[PDB]
Design an enzyme around this catalytic site. Structure first.
Site, PDB file in Angstrom:
ATOM      1  N   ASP A  30      53.519   1.232  35.424  1.00 56.91           N
ATOM      2  CA  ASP A  30      53.681   1.654  36.718  1.00 56.91           C
ATOM      3  C   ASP A  30      55.084   0.871  37.472  1.00 56.91           C
ATOM      4  OD1 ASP A  30      53.094   3.507  38.523  1.00 56.91           O
ATOM      5  OD2 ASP A  30      52.049   1.643  39.786  1.00 56.91           O
TER       6      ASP A  30
ATOM      7  N   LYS B  16      57.950   0.619  39.327  1.00 49.85           N
ATOM      8  CA  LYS B  16      58.688   1.336  40.358  1.00 49.85           C
ATOM      9  C   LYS B  16      59.201   0.231  41.089  1.00 49.85           C
ATOM     10  CE  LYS B  16      55.249   3.518  42.637  1.00 49.85           C
ATOM     11  NZ  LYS B  16      53.725   2.930  42.273  1.00 49.85           N
TER      12      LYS B  16
END
Length: 300
Positions: free
Chosen positions: A129, A131
């Site tokens: 994940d 980001k």
């Protein structure tokens, strides 16, 4: 660790599962962040597993650049997560407030993210994940990767499709088995965004997005120096036989890219280096009747 072992100071934010707090240890006057999650909810939302798996991950991972959890505990209605107190904000808002990042700044952040990924990977743990939103900056300007809700111990392959639409890799969009190499794809997208201001395959609507990701040309903005253009070109590739990080030397091929020549992975890993920016200067916990959920929050 106990609720009486600290002294709450103020709410830092409001999560979906509950607040989190600024706390000072009343033993050494150290600071932490108390992430509180109401059990009642966590379960209403069928989010029990996701919650326990994060705790485990955080229990078995230690890195300068990976956030730390010193422990947990729970009363009759919510669990507590004692964690590092990060002063400085999230790489995302830092980015937006400055349109795009310049080669070295981006290079720095990428380098630290590379290091933590190197770690996670050396234990067959993939993040999943990546980001700008999950990367926090601490007072002295270093990085702290957060939210290990999607990290899984993957020795061979896995399936679960998760993550964030833009930073996601092709083999996940199209439900194929994948190893830790998806992390390198996402890594390339993080770099493209720090330098452009946008993701390469962005599109207001989701499927239009899974579309480009799956079937679109990688075009680079002019001011991109060749190196980055080469790295991103190897990182953001659809063919895993050529994608950097998934080759004969694993992380080493990423760490040894020209774009990272003047980087002493050793100096950086010791936080004995200089940073390109220093960031600046109900509630009834304790209650304890009967807890219908105990059976589910035992490791806490």
């Amino acid at each position: 660790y106990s609720l009486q072992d600290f002294q709450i100071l103020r709410t830092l934010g409001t999560g979906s599962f509950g607040r989190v707090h600024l706390i000072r240890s009343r033993h050494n006057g150290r600071y932490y962040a108390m992430k509180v999650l109401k059990k009642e909810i966590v379960v209403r939302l069928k989010q029990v597993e996701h919650t326990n798996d994060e705790r485990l991950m955080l229990s078995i991972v230690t890195h300068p650049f990976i956030i730390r959890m010193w422990g947990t505990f729970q009363d009759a209605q919510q669990i507590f997560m004692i964690m590092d107190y990060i002063e400085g904000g999230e790489l995302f808002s830092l980015l937006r407030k400055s349109q795009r990042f310049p080669n070295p700044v981006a290079k720095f952040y990428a380098a630290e993210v590379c290091l933590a990924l190197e770690y996670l990977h050396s234990k067959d743990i993939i993040y999943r994940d990546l980001k700008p939103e999950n990367i926090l900056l601490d007072k002295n300007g270093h990085i702290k990767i957060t939210d290990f809700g999607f990290a899984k111990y993957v020795p061979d392959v896995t399936y679960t499709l998760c993550g964030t639409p833009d930073y996601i890799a092709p083999e996940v969009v199209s439900t194929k088995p994948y190893n830790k190499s998806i992390d390198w794809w996402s890594f390339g997208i993080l770099i493209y965004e720090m330098l452009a201001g946008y993701t390469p395959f962005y599109d207001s609507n989701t499927m239009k997005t899974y579309e480009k990701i799956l079937n679109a040309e990688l075009r680079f903005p002019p001011f991109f120096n060749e190196d980055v253009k080469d790295l991103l070109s190897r990182l953001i590739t659809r063919d895993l036989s050529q994608r950097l990080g998934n080759l004969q030397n694993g992380t080493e091929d990423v760490k040894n890219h020209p774009w990272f020549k003047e980087v002493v992975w050793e100096k950086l890993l010791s936080r004995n280096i200089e940073t390109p920016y220093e960031p600046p200067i109900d509630i009834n916990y304790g209650v304890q009747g009967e807890d219908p959920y105990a059976d589910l929050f035992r490791d806490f």
